[PDB]
């Protein structure tokens, strides 16, 4: 019954994770957009002392999001939130019940967070070389069940964790967003269209076809525009190696 | 009934996490050391294609650890293993039952993994300045309950995740091991002994006092000697400014 408020922004794949999970859970919840990159509200550190989105409040009296209550629990870090929503809504089966299959979900989230996420971050924001990102994506793709299905078989929070980032890659590449070189943009677009990455393309289509994605996605062109408001995605800067 | 084998190495904090959790769970399990850094066994990629420790096998027929069975589940990534052990041993209460307290545990693991671990890596393996690491440690200390207790109050896998890294810091500093300068080594030793870091010292003492730590620790001097075998810790080498 306790209220959930998620502080969010359209561009953010980290925040997107949690919106997907809340939709899959069937939760009642409130979202509130926060201009974290240009004009952080003075009250925002009350909901997240790290000053990052997503931020979540849970419980406490029902209050406007821009007047957060000291009585609400303040939850930070998107993966903690995913596990939290799975704990709050056990009937939604946001994780398998079998411990080995639950471990496949946790492993997949850790493979993404530890080996892929940092490569997306560095290729897009620093223009580092794309080959180690493609290698990491090939590794992640190898963790998927070969025949189809999601990271742990049935849909789970592991797929909420990963699809925001993978789903952004294709339209960001097409719009030329990111500090990588022309040569690496070509390299990545060809690779992600190649037979080498057929399995992850089907995974992306399968995650995107779910209502939890459709109802938390502004559309490809609108997300690209959101992303162009990010200062670190400086138009006109590219790095070469 | 299903066997647990953990592929480990004394020096490794990541492997140490999983040993602590298996002790806390009261599990029956086998450990098998792997010389991952100098002489990887040609069979090891069958238990973990990433070629990293820790690696875990679960179930299948009882076999010698250097003859892994294709029938065992192969589990990778230390934090996935920690959640797995909690799932396997629910009566050992390795996570809280309360959703919010559980989220404190998951948040604390994410704070360490996202903001602290990379600072330990940079200072110890690259000799980058120590200040950002001290700052990250102060943030992580701020997440602890100020009056006492573990990350989520009661002991949880969150404390298994973090104590292997914190516990190595003091003996490694005392041994001058790591690529940071003597100046930054003194700076860090002084900082970690000051009242600024009293709370995280109490945290390290409280975690270390548990049998799960004693039974998985070689002793400070022995752990330093294991760490000196790590090529990337470059014993005898320090960067300056
Ligand atoms: N580990 C956290 C990560 C959350 C995070 O990074 N949030 C952002 C998204 S924006 C973002 C996030 C990552 C990177 N990046 O370069 O890695 C760049 C940007 N950006 O906006 O330029 C933020 O709010 N930053 C505000 C701040 O730190 O003051 C989680 O999982 O929830
Ligand atoms: N995310 C994984 C991380 C596991 C990991 O990094 N394991 C190591 C420990 S050694 C290690 C781990 C991290 C760093 N580091 O530079 O950060 C340096 C070293 N090292 O031995 O020099 C390993 O086996 N590496 C072998 C390989 O990659 O082929 C987990 O949580 O289990
Ligand atoms: Ca595979």
3-class DSSP string for chain B = CCCEEEEECCCCHHHHHHHHHHHHHCCCCEEEECCCCCCCCCCHHHCCCCCCCCEEEECCCCCCCCCCCCCCEEEECHHHHHHHHHHHCHHHCCCCCCHHHHHHHHHHHHHHHHHHHHHHHHHHHHCCCCHHHHHHHHHHHHHCCCCCCECEEECCHHHHHHHHHHHHHHHHHHCCCCCCCHHHHHHHHHHHHCHHHHHHHHHHHHHHCCHHHHCCCCCHHHHHHHHHCCHHHCCCCCCCC
Residues A10 and A86 both lie in one domain: yes
Give the position of tokens 């299903």: B2
Q: Which residues of B touch A83 (CB under 8 A)?
A: 102-103, 106
Candidate of A52, A54, A112 to mutate for ligand 1, largest count of ligand atoms within 8 Å of Cβ:
A52
Question: Is residue A124 within 8 Å of A173, Cβ to Cβ?
Answer: no
C-alpha dihedral sign at A18, A23, A26, A31: positive
Experimental determination technique: X-ray
Residues A131 and A12 both lie in one domain: no
Q: What is the DSSP string of chain A?
A: ---EEEEE-TT-HHHHHHHHHHHHHT---EEEE--TTT---TTGGGT-TT--S-EEEESSS---TTS--TTSEEEE-HHHHHHHHHHH-GGG-SS-SSHHHHHHHHHHHHHIIIIIHHHHHHHHHH---SHHHHHHHHHHHHHS-TTSSBTBBB--HHHHHHHHHHHHHHHHHHTT-SSS-HHHHHHHHHHHHSGGGHHHHHHHHHHHTSHHHHTT---HHHHHHHHHT-GGG-TT-----
Pick the closest to residue A130 from A187, A195, A73 (CA basis): A187
Instruction: List CB contacts of A192: < 8 A, sequence separation 6 or more.
Output: A169, A170, A173, A200, A201
Instruction: List CB contacts of A90: < 8 A, sequence separation 6 or more.
Output: none
* A54 prior amide bond cis, ω within 30: yes
Q: B8 to each of A95, B36, B44, B55, B70, how far by Cα in Å?
A: 28, 9, 12, 7, 20
Give the position of tokens 């789970």: A156
Q: From CA B175, how far away is CA B124, in angstroms rounded?
A: 12
Other Cβ atoms closer than 10 A to B50: 13
Residues A64 and A1 both lie in one domain: yes
Atom of ligand 1 nearest to the CA of A76: 32
Instruction: List CB contacts of B84: < 8 A, sequence separation 6 or more.
Output: A99, A100, A102, A103, A106, B56, B58, B75
Residues B57 and B118 both lie in one domain: no
Atom of ligand 1 nearest to the CA of A233: 22
Instruction: Give the residue, by CA position, lying nearest to ligand 2 atom 2.
Output: B77
**Chain B interface, best mutation among A3, A96, A103, A138, by max B CB count within 10 A:** A103
Instruction: List CB contacts of A15: < 8 A, sequence separation 6 or more.
Output: A6, A7, A8, A9, A53, A54, A78
CA-based angle B165:A107:A29, to the nearest 5?
100
Q: For chain A, say whether B217 makes contact (Cβ under 8 Å).
A: no
Contact A83 B77 (CB under 8 A): no
Candidate of B52, B53, B77, B162 to mutate for ligand 2, largest count of ligand atoms within 8 Å of Cβ:
B52
Residues A40 and A111 both lie in one domain: no
Identity of the residue in B80, B100, B111 whose CB atom sits nearest the CB atom of A110: B80
Pocket of ligand 1 (CB under 6 A): A 12, 14, 36-37, 51-54, 77-79, 121, 125, 230, 232; B 114
Instruction: List CB contacts of A85: < 8 A, sequence separation 6 or more.
Output: A18, A21, A22, A25, A27, A94, A157
Domain boundary, last residue among B97, B115, B134:
B97
Residues A61 and A156 both lie in one domain: no
Q: A105 to each of A102, A149, A220, B67, B172, how far by Cα in Å?
A: 5, 12, 27, 26, 35
Pick the closest to residue B13 from B149, B123, B140, B162 (CA basis): B162
Instruction: List CB contacts of A1: < 8 A, sequence separation 6 or more.
Output: none
Instruction: Give the residue, by CA position, lying nearest to ligand 2 atom 18.
Output: B232
Q: From CA B193, how far away is CA B208, in angstroms rounded?
A: 17
Strand partners, A75: A56
Q: For chain A, say whether B73 makes contact (Cβ under 8 Å).
A: yes
Residue B159 sits in which domain range? 98-241
Residues A2 and A71 both lie in one domain: yes
Candidate of B8, B11, B14, B33 to mutate for ligand 2, largest count of ligand atoms within 8 Å of Cβ:
B14
Contact B139 A87 (CB under 8 A): no
Residues B14 and B105 both lie in one domain: no
Give the position of tokens 């027929």: B61
Contact A83 B106 (CB under 8 A): yes
Q: Which two tokens stand for residue B67?
A: 């003859």
Contact A102 B79 (CB under 8 A): no
Domain boundary, last residue among A52, A72, A97:
A97
Residues B132 and B217 both lie in one domain: yes
Instruction: List CB contacts of B147: < 8 A, sequence separation 6 or more.
Output: none
Question: Is residue B203 within 8 Å of B213, Cβ to Cβ?
Answer: no
Pick the closest to residue A125 from A12, A237, A13 (CA basis): A237
The residues whose Cβ lies within 5 A of ligand 3, an ion, are: A 142
Residues A120 and A232 both lie in one domain: yes
Number of domains in chain B: 2
Q: Which two tokens stand for residue B148?
A: 């006492």
Domain boundary, last residue among B97, B120, B136:
B97
Q: Which residues of A touch B72 (CB under 8 A)?
A: none
Specify the resolution in Å: 1.8
Contact B111 A81 (CB under 8 A): no
Identity of the residue in A59, A75, A99 whose CB atom sits nearest the CB atom of B87: A99
Residues B138 and B199 both lie in one domain: yes
Residues A3 and A45 both lie in one domain: yes
Q: From CA A215, how far away is CA A205, in angstroms rounded?
A: 15
Other Cβ atoms closer than 10 A to B240: 10
């Amino acid at each position: 019954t306790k209220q959930i408020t998620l502080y969010t922004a359209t561009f953010s794949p980290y925040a997107h994770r949690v919106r997907i999970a809340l939709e899959e859970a069937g939760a009642e919840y409130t979202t509130y957009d926060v201009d974290i990159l240009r004009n952080m509200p003075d009250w925002f550190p009350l909901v997240n002392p790290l000053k990052k989105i997503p931020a979540m409040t849970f419980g406490g009296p029902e209050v406007p999001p821009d007047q957060p209550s000291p009585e609400s629990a303040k939850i930070a870090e998107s993966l903690a939130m995913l596990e939290f929503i799975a704990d709050l809504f056990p009937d939604a089966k946001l994780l398998p019940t079998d411990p080995v299959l639950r471990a496949r979900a946790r492993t997949f989230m850790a493979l993404y967070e530890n080996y892929v996420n940092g490569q997306f971050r560095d290729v897009w924001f620093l223009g580092t070389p794309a080959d180690p990102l493609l290698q990491a994506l090939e590794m992640l793709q190898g963790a998927l069940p070969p025949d189809g299905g999601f990271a742990a078989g049935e849909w789970s929070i592991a797929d909420a964790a990963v699809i925001p980032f993978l789903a952004r890659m294709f339209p960001y590449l097409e719009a030329g967003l990111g500090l990588y070189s022309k040569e690496d943009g070509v390299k990545m677009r060809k690779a992600m269209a190649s037979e080498r990455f057929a399995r992850i393309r089907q995974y992306v289509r399968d995650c995107r076809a779910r209502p939890s994605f459709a109802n938390t996605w502004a559309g490809d062109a609108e997300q690209v525009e959101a992303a162009k408001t990010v200062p670190m995605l400086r138009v006109g800067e590219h790095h070469h190696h």
